[PDB]
C-alpha cells in the first residue's frame, strides 16, 4: 500500500510517500521519521487519501 505525510513545520516543509504493508505500521513508521527531522506536531490521518500530516 502506498501512504503520505505532509510535514507542516515552521522552517520545512515537505511532501514524503512510502509503501507499507499495514497502516498501523506506517504511522509507526512516519512518528519515528517526524522526531528523527526534530518536527514535533500534532497529527492527523485521512483514510480516504492515506494521509498523514504532521503540523508544527
Ligand atoms: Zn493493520
Ligand atoms: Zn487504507
Do not use: S
Given at each position: ?45 485521512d483514510?480516504?487519501?492515506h ?6
Amino acid at each position: 500500500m502506498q501512504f503520505k505525510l505532509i510535514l507542516n513545520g515552521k522552517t520545512l516543509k515537505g511532501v514524503i510517500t512510502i509503501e507499507a504493508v499495514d497502516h498501523a505500521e506506517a504511522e509507526k513508521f512516519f512518528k519515528q521519521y517526524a522526531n528523527d527531522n526534530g518536527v514535533d506536531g500534532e497529527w492527523t490521518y485521512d483514510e480516504a487519501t492515506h494521509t498523514f500530516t504532521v503540523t508544527e
